[PDB]
Design a protein around this ligand. Structure first.
Ligand SMILES: CCCS(=O)(=O)Nc1ccc(F)c(C(=O)c2c[nH]c3ncc(-c4ccc(Cl)cc4)cc23)c1F
Length: 261
């Protein structure tokens, strides 16, 4: 079993949430990230369900994917991954002052696309892709997280597709809805802002994005943004999930764009 024995893992600096739990800067002589799952009294049923999904994290291994190091049962259900010293992409873009050149802006997008391309190759739908789950490792490598517990909403609707928002299906999520979320990530990178800064009401954004009368303002992108990047971003943000490009052709046009400039 991959189960880390009790006591070997300790938590310290709290980061926050953290879908299906709470993440910490943990430790076992080597900085690791610990997600403390919100499960009080584990019944042997959901303990097995968590066991099986851990079994998935075992063989889902990629360079732009958060490395799964192990899990815990006692004293609390925890997911242990590697620690990214460069924090998350949301922090650098919206929470701090960091001179981001277009050079590495596009590169962050390229690594994020490949990480998502692998997840879709492994037939995994992320469902939570945002700049909060994009972590910058100290070796200047983008790491995607919060994709676990796939076979098992709050409270970030900025990255949610119009068809996901409404919603109409019990399972509205698809590979194409992951693309839209990536399209917002692209928007954050190029503009340097979260979408819908003008509108404050969360209830109104729900109504308007679902309606189709509210879209990210592509005008607020930086002047040094390549034009091929902009309309690619526009294709990812299209309302109908049918017309959205797949990650294979997303990754294709981005990496070929990097060698043009
Ligand atoms: C294999 C993947 C398992 S998963 O359940 O699907 N995903 C999963 C599992 C456990 C986690 F602890 C995390 C997670 O959140 C982080 C993982 N490494 C990090 N490094 C820095 C920050 C950070 C540092 C500083 C700021 Cl200011 C913000 C964030 C956040 C994380 C995670 F995304």
């Amino acid at each position: 079993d991959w189960e880390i024995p009790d006591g070997q893992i300790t938590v310290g600096q709290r980061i926050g949430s953290g879908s299906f739990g709470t993440v910490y800067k943990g430790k076992w002589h080597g900085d690791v990230a610990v997600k403390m799952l919100n499960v009080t009294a584990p019944t042997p049923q959901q303990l097995q369900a968590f066991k099986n999904e851990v079994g998935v994290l075992r063989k889902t291994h990629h360079v732009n994917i958060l490395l799964f190091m192990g899990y815990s049962t006692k004293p609390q259900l925890a997911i242990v991954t590697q620690w990214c010293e460069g924090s998350s992409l949301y922090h650098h873009l919206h929470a701090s002052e960091t001179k981001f050149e277009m050079k590495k802006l596009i590169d962050i997008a390229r690594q994020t696309a490949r990480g998502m391309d692998y997840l879709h190759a492994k037939s995994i739908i992320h469902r939570d892709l945002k700049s909060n789950n994009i972590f910058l490792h100290e070796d200047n490598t983008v790491k995607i997280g919060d994709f676990g517990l796939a076979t098992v909403l709050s409270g970030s609707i900025l990255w949610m597709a119009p068809e996901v928002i409404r919603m109409q299906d019990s399972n509205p999520y698809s590979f194409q809805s992951d693309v839209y979320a990536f399209g917002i990530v692209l928007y954050e990178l190029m503009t340097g802002q979260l979408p819908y800064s003008n509108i404050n009401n969360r209830d109104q954004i729900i109504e308007m994005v679902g309606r189709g009368s509210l879209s990210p303002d592509l005008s607020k992108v930086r002047s040094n943004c390549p034009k091929r990047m902009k309309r690619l971003m526009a294709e990812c943000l299209k309302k109908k999930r049918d017309e959205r490009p797949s990650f294979p052709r997303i990754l294709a046009e981005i990496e070929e764009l990097a060698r043009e400039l």
